[PDB]
Design a protein around this ligand. Structure first.
Ligand SMILES: c1ccc2c(CN3CCCCCC3)c[nH]c2c1
Ligand SMILES: c1ccc2c(CN3CCCCCC3)c[nH]c2c1
Ligand SMILES: c1ccc2c(CN3CCCCCC3)c[nH]c2c1
Ligand SMILES: c1ccc2c(CN3CCCCCC3)c[nH]c2c1
Ligand SMILES: [Zn+2]
Ligand SMILES: [Zn+2]
Ligand SMILES: [Zn+2]
Ligand SMILES: [Zn+2]
Lengths: 360, 360
């Protein structure tokens, strides 16, 4: 059976289990069950399922070289699917809450969940909470007796926490760190001293890389009982690297991809994001370019957003991106090489993750 | 050492551990550490600590009748304190998110967290997320090797989920169930057919009783390794009953306690809450009283909120409250009696929980 139809079949199974359990144990009525079904479909479906399918792909690699009964192969593939949906629901939680936090309008060519007429922020914040709670309901039901439950829950917990810390890094990236104070309304940075590669790297590592690359790879190893087939430090280092590349590509597309293909109107410039474009521009700008950037960045005024996009264009950031990309290819190829020492199979799953990221 | 100074000492220990771990493992800077310290103090401290201290009290009861080394007594008391702070942080999460959801202005005589000038909703939603993530960081660090970790995490998970489901029950309690539809803006009920005791009971059981009474009692039993000293069905039934009484008292105070003593201006009437007052009023109103209620309920207009408060006053709901209270006393005394069959110690902790609720 093809990996994707297995994954989607498990979505239907996990949805039915969750909604049936709300009816049998949580006293839910049919109308609220329907609302939660529709919230689940709207918030969890419609992407590429890259994160969840990575768990499945890693598990498939190990199945091709490991002796098991047929029934055990089916159990491992089911477990990989459930663990993949745990990550897809964790993401769904963060996308719902982030869209509310950032006052976002669209995602994947549809209104943000909170903007649905019958939802509103009051409901959406709690729907987000429910989405993350469903990750734990899935785990405890499907993995109750599994030898990897402890390790999976502890990892999942740490990655969820890392993500929430990265969110804090991201929402505060345009503030001066010395001025952060719950008692005082936060002015935007005037110097942009904190728009550095190391500070950018810290945001992306916590907000994106742990849940998008580390967790899917390590969960594929845990459901496979294969974590001692790998050097965990190499897994962390290659996750780091690939996830950062993913986020740099995202940041470039925010500014330069047509809205019709992006699924939204990019607002990183108006939101004064610590973006790869802003850090890379400041890393090569002359004094006049820096001064014009400070005059225009972080403002809704379309004229000022256009002055920032023209500054980025004139600054030939395509060159910097090509150089960054070439350095990432060297380093990720080097880490895939080191991974082949303890597991060729796992090294090959990382190579697939990298291919799917590099030209998406 | 007095229970309360032990509990507060552990807050300082757990705060230091969390902030030190953010610095050693999550690359946090001093200014963001200070912001999170202040968010933790502002959102977790200043209440009565009833929920957390219940874990400590249940553990203290078992210590008085169970042979242990001194060091083991100290470990159980520490564990009860950490488990109590897990519930206090879980509550803090829900109070932050609920204040944002409901557009609340004050809590405990201070602005809601999201309303602090240097916070805003963008940050506060994520601060709420962090608060619940800290529950899991506490558990995994302090309880890593504990025999009760599995059972504690599974219970905690289910109670958190129940609470989020109850939130959904509460925010949708003024909608007609058949009209719930994410695609369609929700009108307020015109008939109030769903303002019934059974529907009220469902809201309160899920939103309040699991985290405020069931979880503290059962966590005190888990850290004590004493869960087979009790009939879990009796624990669920007495938690049910006491928690509902707590929420009925809350609802009455929303309408009738001066704001200076409430710590806020009650808005349940304007928010069209399915409150004990609204259900109890509709349970005894004549046709003209019901019609005037429908004309005025669920509107910001102070004149209309005053018409609802005068309707409640004229309706002598004090009588209904006295009758309800008398029925709760019978039933809770009956359940404390049944609990004494398997554990007198535990029965006595439930009696203390009830006394502290009954005349607060
Ligand atoms: C699709 C889905 C997720 C992402 C992210 C990652 N960020 C999402 C926002 C919430 C938490 C921060 C991480 C960048 N681009 C995306 C395209
Ligand atoms: C500035 C920097 C880089 C680029 C690119 C190259 N793109 C490759 C497609 C994947 C996403 C990365 C961007 C096109 N326009 C740019 C302007
Ligand atoms: C102090 C603290 C908590 C409560 C509640 C319980 N509700 C809180 C709001 C969030 C989740 C629903 C439960 C009622 N009155 C309170 C006084
Ligand atoms: C309507 C219903 C009951 C009452 C009470 C009795 N109060 C006892 C104090 C604890 C909280 C419950 C309320 C005073 N005014 C009321 C109006
Ligand atoms: Zn965001
Ligand atoms: Zn982006
Ligand atoms: Zn509320
Ligand atoms: Zn209330």
């Amino acid at each position: 059976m093809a990996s994707m139809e297995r994954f989607l079949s498990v979505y239907d199974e996990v949805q039915a289990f969750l909604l049936d359990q709300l009816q049998s144990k949580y006293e839910i009525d049919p109308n609220r069950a329907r609302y939660l079904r529709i919230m689940m479909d709207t918030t969890c479906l419609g992407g590429k399922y890259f994160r969840g399918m990575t768990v499945v792909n890693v598990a498939e690699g190990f199945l091709a070289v490991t002796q098991h009964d047929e029934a055990t192969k089916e159990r491992i593939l089911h477990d990989a699917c459930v663990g993949g949906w745990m990550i897809e629901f964790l993401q769904a939680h963060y996308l719902v809450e982030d869209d509310i936090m950032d006052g976002s309008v669209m995602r994947r060519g549809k209104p943000c969940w909170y903007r649905f007429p019958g939802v509103t922020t009051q409901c959406a914040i709690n729907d987000g909470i429910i989405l993350k709670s469903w990750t734990q309901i899935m785990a405890w039901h499907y993995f109750a007796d599994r030898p990897f439950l402890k390790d999976l829950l502890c990892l999942f917990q740490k990655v969820d926490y890392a993500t929430a810390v990265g969110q804090m890094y991201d929402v505060t990236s345009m503030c001066d760190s010395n001025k952060l104070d719950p008692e005082v309304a936060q002015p935007m940075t005037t110097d942009f001293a904190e728009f550095t590669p190391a500070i950018y790297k810290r945001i992306v590592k916590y907000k994106t890389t742990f849940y998008t690359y580390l967790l899917p790879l390590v969960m594929g190893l845990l459901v496979s009982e294969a974590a001692a087939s790998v050097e965990m430090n190499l897994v962390e280092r290659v996750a780091h690297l690939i996830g950062e590349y993913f986020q740099v590509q995202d940041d470039v597309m925010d500014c330069f991809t047509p809205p019709e293909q992006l699924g939204k109107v990019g607002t990183d410039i108006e939101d004064a994001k610590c973006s790869w474009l802003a850090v890379t521009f400041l890393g090569k700008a002359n004094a006049a370019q820096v001064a014009e950037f400070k005059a225009n960045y972080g403002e809704k005024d379309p004229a000022k957003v256009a002055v920032v996009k023209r500054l980025y264009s004139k600054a030939n950031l395509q060159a910097d991106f090509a150089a960054y990309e070439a350095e990432v290819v060297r380093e990720v190829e080097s880490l895939i090489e080191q991974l082949k020492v303890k597991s060729p199979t796992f090294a090959e799953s990382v190579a697939v993750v990298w291919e799917k990221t590099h030209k998406r």
